[PDB]
Design a protein around this nucleic acid. Structure first.
Ligand code: MN
Ligand code: MN
Ligand code: MN
Ligand code: NA
Length: 347
DNA sequence: CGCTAGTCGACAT
DNA sequence: TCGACTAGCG
């Protein structure tokens, strides 16, 4: 998540409605609807009590798209990424802290304070996501479980032309290179749209509108894969790239103390972390739904060795990757929890 | 002015 | 899964 990116390129956004893609295919970052659908029933999920309200919350969004001729492809998060394990461990640490502190407030009498901690300790399990998959499949809607982060899976579906828009709330999809991203879409279907081609209307970007330079700007500002240098945001990162009259990104990062004229010490591990993060935005493992196989988000280049890309995801057998993508195989237990088969009537 | 970190919000009755 | 918002800092 690039902080403040949406307010940094506002001049490239215009409010639209989902009718502009009537009769087209639009993928969805479905986990955003699960987080909003679980707030209305946070205390129930915190106490382990059975609840299916979030199932109905995600369905009114799906049924709303079906009413406008949209063919949604619900994409769901999968396994944990090694490049995101530091953030995933911290989020799991804060969910456990709010859960323990929320249960402590139940043993006192504070009902409003315990509810606030419950809404911040929401853990969207894969079983909760699989409930929405069953409800969406009962209505004839495609559902795809990403091998890891849904962000990379959404980026491939949009680049490969399978879908023409990505309905989401995260700003990372712009860094992955999505052509059309629809943000802040209410239950009625109204939101903002940011096209990758219209990024030139942002005067504060300069010549940093190409996919490679825009990807470099998001990482230097601070993403979930690599924390930014102390004092480096989107503006200063964009300033380094505008003045970067050099295609080699490694020498430009070392020279960040010169392009900005600041006392910036760059450890060597941060340089290896940038190459680690740039390859994750480029070569993260997605799932090809047509050919049914594990492929990187972008095709491998000649100046990269895929042997050093374990942090971007681990390959498995195409049959195992298919059962995970179909939601039949659980993410953690790796056991068959369902028996859906798309052959016996996206794929 | 730009960046950082904490807070409040997302639901809905 | 995320971001919007502002006070406090350089
Ligand atoms: Mn997760
Ligand atoms: Mn994501
Ligand atoms: Mn993301
Ligand atoms: Na930053």
């Amino acid at each position: 998540g690039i902080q403040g990116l949406l307010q940094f390129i506002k001049e490239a956004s215009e409010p639209i409605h989902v009718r502009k893609y009537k009769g087209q295919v639009v993928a969805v970052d479905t986990y955003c609807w699960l987080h909003k659908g679980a707030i209305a029933c946070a205390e129930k999920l915190a106490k382990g009590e059975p609840t299916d309200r979030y199932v109905g919350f995600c369905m009114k969004f799906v049924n709303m798209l079906l009413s406008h001729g949209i063919k949604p492809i619900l994409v769901f998060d999968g396994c944990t990424l090694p490049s995101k394990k530091e953030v995933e461990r911290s989020r799991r640490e804060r969910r456990q802290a709010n859960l323990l502190k929320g249960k402590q407030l139940l043993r006192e009498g504070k009902v409003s304070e315990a509810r606030e901690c419950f809404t911040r300790s929401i853990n969207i399990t894969h079983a909760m996501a699989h409930k929405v998959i069953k409800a969406a499949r009962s209505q004839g809607v495609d559902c795809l479980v990403a091998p890891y982060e849904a962000d990379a899976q959404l980026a491939y579906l949009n680049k490969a032309g399978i879908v023409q828009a990505i309905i989401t709330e995260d700003s990372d999809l712009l860094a992955f290179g999505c052509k059309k991203v629809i943000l802040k879409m209410d239950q009625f279907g109204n939101g903002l749209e940011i096209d990758q081609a219209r990024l030139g209307m942002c005067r504060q970007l300069g010549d940093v509108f190409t996919e490679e330079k825009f990807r470099y700007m998001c990482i230097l500002s601070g993403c979930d894969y690599l924390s930014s240098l102390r004092g480096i945001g989107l503006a200063k990162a964009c300033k380094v790239l505008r003045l970067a009259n050099n295609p080699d990104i490694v020498k430009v990062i070392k020279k960040i103390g010169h392009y900005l004229k600041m006392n910036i010490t760059v450890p060597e591990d941060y340089i290896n972390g940038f190459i680690r993060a740039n390859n994750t935005f480029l070569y993260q493992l997605v799932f090809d739904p047509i050919k049914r196989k594990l492929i990187p988000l972008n095709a491998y280049e000649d100046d990269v060795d895929p042997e050093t890309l374990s942090y971007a995801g681990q390959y498995v057998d195409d049959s195992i990757a298919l059962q995970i993508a179909l939601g039949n195989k659980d993410i953690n237990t790796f056991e068959q929890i369902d028996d859906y088969n798309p052959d016996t009537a996206l794929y």
